[PDB]
């Protein structure tokens, strides 16, 4: 869940 945000937040 919201794993797409943490993904972008971790990358960016």
PDBQT receptor file of N, H, CA, C and O in Angstrom, charges set to zero:
ATOM      1  N   UNK A   1       0.860  -1.216   0.000  1.00  0.00    +0.000 N 
ATOM      2  CA  UNK A   1       0.000   0.000   0.000  1.00  0.00    +0.000 C 
ATOM      3  C   UNK A   1       0.881   1.245   0.000  1.00  0.00    +0.000 C 
ATOM      4  O   UNK A   1       1.899   1.296   0.690  1.00  0.00    +0.000 OA
ATOM      5  N   UNK A   2       0.481   2.246  -0.779  1.00  0.00    +0.000 N 
ATOM      6  H   UNK A   2      -0.345   2.205  -1.339  1.00  0.00    +0.000 HD
ATOM      7  CA  UNK A   2       1.241   3.491  -0.862  1.00  0.00    +0.000 C 
ATOM      8  C   UNK A   2       2.710   3.194  -1.126  1.00  0.00    +0.000 C 
ATOM      9  O   UNK A   2       3.563   4.078  -1.037  1.00  0.00    +0.000 OA
ATOM     10  N   UNK A   3       2.991   1.942  -1.449  1.00  0.00    +0.000 N 
ATOM     11  H   UNK A   3       2.298   1.224  -1.521  1.00  0.00    +0.000 HD
ATOM     12  CA  UNK A   3       4.359   1.520  -1.726  1.00  0.00    +0.000 C 
ATOM     13  C   UNK A   3       4.895   2.236  -2.959  1.00  0.00    +0.000 C 
ATOM     14  O   UNK A   3       6.098   2.227  -3.221  1.00  0.00    +0.000 OA
ATOM     15  N   UNK A   4       3.994   2.855  -3.710  1.00  0.00    +0.000 N 
ATOM     16  H   UNK A   4       3.016   2.862  -3.497  1.00  0.00    +0.000 HD
ATOM     17  CA  UNK A   4       4.380   3.581  -4.911  1.00  0.00    +0.000 C 
ATOM     18  C   UNK A   4       4.939   4.950  -4.544  1.00  0.00    +0.000 C 
ATOM     19  O   UNK A   4       5.747   5.520  -5.277  1.00  0.00    +0.000 OA
ATOM     20  N   UNK A   5       4.501   5.469  -3.402  1.00  0.00    +0.000 N 
ATOM     21  H   UNK A   5       3.845   5.006  -2.807  1.00  0.00    +0.000 HD
ATOM     22  CA  UNK A   5       4.961   6.763  -2.930  1.00  0.00    +0.000 C 
ATOM     23  C   UNK A   5       6.360   6.635  -2.348  1.00  0.00    +0.000 C 
ATOM     24  O   UNK A   5       7.277   7.369  -2.718  1.00  0.00    +0.000 OA
ATOM     25  N   UNK A   6       6.502   5.690  -1.431  1.00  0.00    +0.000 N 
ATOM     26  H   UNK A   6       5.757   5.094  -1.130  1.00  0.00    +0.000 HD
ATOM     27  CA  UNK A   6       7.768   5.433  -0.784  1.00  0.00    +0.000 C 
ATOM     28  C   UNK A   6       8.818   5.075  -1.815  1.00  0.00    +0.000 C 
ATOM     29  O   UNK A   6      10.017   5.240  -1.594  1.00  0.00    +0.000 OA
ATOM     30  N   UNK A   7       8.342   4.583  -2.940  1.00  0.00    +0.000 N 
ATOM     31  H   UNK A   7       7.368   4.449  -3.120  1.00  0.00    +0.000 HD
ATOM     32  CA  UNK A   7       9.202   4.191  -4.028  1.00  0.00    +0.000 C 
ATOM     33  C   UNK A   7       9.780   5.422  -4.701  1.00  0.00    +0.000 C 
ATOM     34  O   UNK A   7      10.976   5.498  -4.985  1.00  0.00    +0.000 OA
ATOM     35  N   UNK A   8       8.910   6.374  -4.947  1.00  0.00    +0.000 N 
ATOM     36  H   UNK A   8       7.939   6.312  -4.717  1.00  0.00    +0.000 HD
ATOM     37  CA  UNK A   8       9.307   7.623  -5.585  1.00  0.00    +0.000 C 
ATOM     38  C   UNK A   8      10.062   8.501  -4.600  1.00  0.00    +0.000 C 
ATOM     39  O   UNK A   8      11.008   9.199  -4.965  1.00  0.00    +0.000 OA
ATOM     40  N   UNK A   9       9.631   8.454  -3.352  1.00  0.00    +0.000 N 
ATOM     41  H   UNK A   9       8.863   7.887  -3.055  1.00  0.00    +0.000 HD
ATOM     42  CA  UNK A   9      10.246   9.229  -2.299  1.00  0.00    +0.000 C 
ATOM     43  C   UNK A   9      11.656   8.715  -2.006  1.00  0.00    +0.000 C 
ATOM     44  O   UNK A   9      12.551   9.493  -1.675  1.00  0.00    +0.000 OA
ATOM     45  N   UNK A  10      11.845   7.405  -2.131  1.00  0.00    +0.000 N 
ATOM     46  H   UNK A  10      11.118   6.773  -2.400  1.00  0.00    +0.000 HD
ATOM     47  CA  UNK A  10      13.146   6.807  -1.878  1.00  0.00    +0.000 C 
ATOM     48  C   UNK A  10      14.093   7.081  -3.042  1.00  0.00    +0.000 C 
ATOM     49  O   UNK A  10      15.293   7.276  -2.847  1.00  0.00    +0.000 OA
ATOM     50  N   UNK A  11      13.541   7.093  -4.251  1.00  0.00    +0.000 N 
ATOM     51  H   UNK A  11      12.566   6.934  -4.409  1.00  0.00    +0.000 HD
ATOM     52  CA  UNK A  11      14.331   7.341  -5.442  1.00  0.00    +0.000 C 
ATOM     53  C   UNK A  11      14.585   8.836  -5.610  1.00  0.00    +0.000 C 
ATOM     54  O   UNK A  11      15.708   9.257  -5.889  1.00  0.00    +0.000 OA
ATOM     55  N   UNK A  12      13.533   9.628  -5.438  1.00  0.00    +0.000 N 
ATOM     56  H   UNK A  12      12.621   9.286  -5.212  1.00  0.00    +0.000 HD
ATOM     57  CA  UNK A  12      13.643  11.079  -5.574  1.00  0.00    +0.000 C 
ATOM     58  C   UNK A  12      13.734  11.740  -4.202  1.00  0.00    +0.000 C 
ATOM     59  O   UNK A  12      13.833  12.963  -4.112  1.00  0.00    +0.000 OA
TER      60      UNK A  12
